[PDB]
């Protein structure tokens, strides 16, 4: 199985506990269909050199494995799930893929694509093609456009379609169609894989209020932190709060919503502020005058907790969550020029994945932030990720923890 | 000297003769000042990872040197020239640099920068900082903005500021100020270096009609080919024709002007059509319905030859220059999808540098084009240049031939 023997379900109650199991996706053929005219639509800053991007991704996975982490590749998880699923589920996956296609499928193309999918020889090939997009060339048909079904090029950013939340999961209604389509795989594995089937959901795509995993943080057993960003709205955090209170087994007690600049290229809270050790946070100064906070009381706030403004400065707000003096590390370090802060913030300099408290993985390119982290006593495991970085995410964006060991607070 | 023993002046009478000496520039500190908000202004598609871009450039230079080519780095050529120049010339280089600064310098900043440049201890440091740009930090002053003098980030594209044309040169009035500033160095080396001082100029920056080197091609001893592009105007080619007829030592007989798509990111003729062997040419089909041609008669067209429409299709037009049937190789090869042609054309897939007939150097990333060239009998010497490619130029754009061996047609 893609899961090691100790994996006994979703268990993510911090951003920093020793990482046990994690979900990633090496970009497949879907990034080969990114064209110059569609960069804004497809959510890329520039076109990736595909072979090199895959080589970088393998280095990232190799570093995670060198740290005894169980790395689950999305394609393999979906295929494994497909293989053991009922025929009813196998069939509905293909039907829902067709109904949710972009561009919308004509009746004739729906039949042609269905047959093509059904004829794929292995479940892995079926999953690869559904992620890749489908051309008229793949189908052997004449058409006036080359892409009969668009790629889901952002799939390598597994942070975003769903988020592990304690021992439950939130499966999201994403902002843009190009990414909403990725949640088909999320619903499928959680609804059918024996090791995930019993996981309770606190959000699902049908709710239609925008939220993405890059905005979701599990600071400790009591407090969740969710961004109010270009991708997640405050009203959506309000619905999340309602769902959590409605779930009697869910033990979180508070949600702090954090406002960030609504930049299309720094679209989630994790591109502005992350927690990397028990008391260390990495942030971009560019957000200094935009940060704003709201608290939700999941215990004594009623069945529908409302967001209450918290006027403390960022440091005091963070202190109210961990009850220790926080250490705030700025992008590019003390003394950096505005140009250096803008450049390293642009390349997702805050977006490190913590694999144990104070030990993080992220791109080698943000050298001043790497040095700032090391000076603050955080160990940095860099990897070359220049091509992957053009998709506007770093290691945190490219991962979704499935299980972490308890933190000794 | 940066020039090897045999160099005896500009000698470029073809696009393909065995390359003997060539001018390049490894991107210096100037590319560290490219910020997200200024990408369009500075002419970049995305920000480069500077360290990796310099390593890629060293690999390009290593490939050139392995083919017995004298590679001249612009910084070293300017410093060598400065060390041999009259005090009047050394002083005027500084004054013209200040006069042409962007942003325009206040009188106070003009004095502070002049003093700072005069205090540099070596000519190479002086040249490096003029290219890099100058910050308030470099000067140790307080200022409203961090850049007191902007970088010239595009300097590594040495194809553009001036072009070798037979045994003369065209020093250009470029389209945008961010690049016009680079011509300061072109004028300096040709006006002062003993090995370049007798080179006749057929164009100079004071002429104020736009033309850039990526548009200039020397097909053979008789025919020049100049693009009408986003950067070079037909009226400028007309002025160039007038200048060549006035120069009684210049032996070219004809200029063919080739209209190309006016795309901001494919801005020169050499991003649409190049000549790589005696009868082989590489082109992007995206330009098919845009190519249009004009001829200038430099022999019997009077003192001011005018552009005369040439209605031949591309194949016939090229045949009228080389006097035999051309082989036209399309970007990405026969059978490529439109997505592939769009992607490889975008990454300057036509922009190869020929180092001898039918032997070219270009980025490894355009794999389908590299395969099409090899299938057409052209040897490709690829190098990894993904970061350099984000500047929207390939190997031809990163080089300016100074001398080539005669071609045996």
Curated annotation (Swiss-Prot), chains A, B:
Protein name: Arginine deiminase
Pathway listed: Amino-acid degradation; L-arginine degradation via ADI pathway; carbamoyl phosphate from L-arginine: step 1/2
GO cellular component, one term: cytoplasm
Active site (UniProt): 397 (amidino-cysteine intermediate)
Family under the similarity heading: Belongs to the arginine deiminase family.
Disulphide linkage map: none
Record localization: Cytoplasm
Pfam families: ADI
Entry's Gene Ontology BP terms: arginine catabolic process to ornithine; arginine deiminase pathway
Known EC number: 3.5.3.6
Quaternary state and interactors: Homodimer.
Molecular function GO terms recorded: arginine deiminase activity
The entry's keywords: Arginine metabolism, Cytoplasm, Hydrolase
PANTHER family in the record: ARGININE DEIMINASE (PTHR47271:SF2)
Catalyzed reactions: L-arginine + H2O = L-citrulline + NH4(+)
InterPro entries: Arg_deiminase
Keyword rRNA-binding found: no
């Amino acid at each position: 199985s893609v899961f090691d023997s100790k994996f006994k379900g979703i268990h993510v109650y911090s951003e920093i506990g020793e990482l046990e199991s994690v979900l990633v996706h090496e970009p497949g053929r879907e990034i080969d269909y990114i064209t110059p005219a569609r960069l804004d639509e497809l959510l890329f800053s520039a076109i990736l050199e595909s072979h090199d991007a895959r080589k970088e991704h393998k280095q990232f996975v190799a570093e995670l494995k060198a740290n005894d982490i169980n790395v689950v590749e999305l394609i393999d998880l979906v295929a494994e799930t497909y293989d053991l699923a009922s025929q009813e589920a196998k069939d509905k996956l293909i039907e829902e893929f067709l109904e949710d296609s972009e561009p919308v499928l004509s009746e004739e193309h729906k039949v042609v694509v269905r047959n093509f999918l059904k004829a794929k020889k292995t479940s892995r090939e079926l999953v690869e093609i559904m992620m890749a997009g489908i051309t008229k060339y793949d189908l052997g048909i004449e058409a006036d456009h080359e892409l009969i079904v668009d790629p889901m090029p952002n799939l390598y950013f597994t942070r975003d379609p769903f988020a592990s939340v304690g021992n439950g999961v939130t499966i999201h209604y994403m902002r843009y169609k190009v990414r909403q389509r990725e949640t088909l795989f999320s619903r499928f594995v959680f609804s059918n894989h024996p090791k995930l089937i019993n996981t309770p959901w606190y959000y699902d795509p049908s709710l239609k209020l925008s939220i993405e995993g890059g905005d979701v943080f599990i600071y400790n057993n009591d407090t969740l932190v969710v961004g109010v960003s270009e991708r997640t709205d405050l009203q959506t955090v309000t619905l999340l709060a309602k769902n959590i209170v409605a779930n009697k087994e869910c033990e979180f007690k508070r949600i702090v919503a954090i406002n960030v600049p609504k930049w299309t290229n720094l679209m989630h809270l994790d591109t502005w502020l992350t927690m990397l050790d028990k008391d260390k946070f990495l942030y971009s100064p560019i957000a200094n005058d935009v940060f704003k906070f709201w608290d939700y009381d999941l215990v004594n706030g009623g069945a529908e907790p409302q967001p209450v403004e918290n006027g403390l400065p960022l440091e005091g707000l963070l202190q109210s969550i961990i009850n220790k003096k926080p250490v705030l590390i700025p992008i590019a370090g003390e003394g950096a020029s505005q140009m250096e802060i803008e450049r390293e913030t642009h390349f997702d300099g805050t977006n490190y994945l913590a694999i144990r408290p104070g030990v993080v993985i992220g791109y080698s390119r943000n050298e001043k932030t790497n040095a700032a982290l090391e000076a603050a006593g955080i160990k940095v495991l860099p990897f070359h990720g220049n091509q992957l970085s053009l998709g506007m995410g770093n290691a945190r964006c490219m991962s979704m923890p499935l299980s972490r060991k308890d933190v000794k607070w």
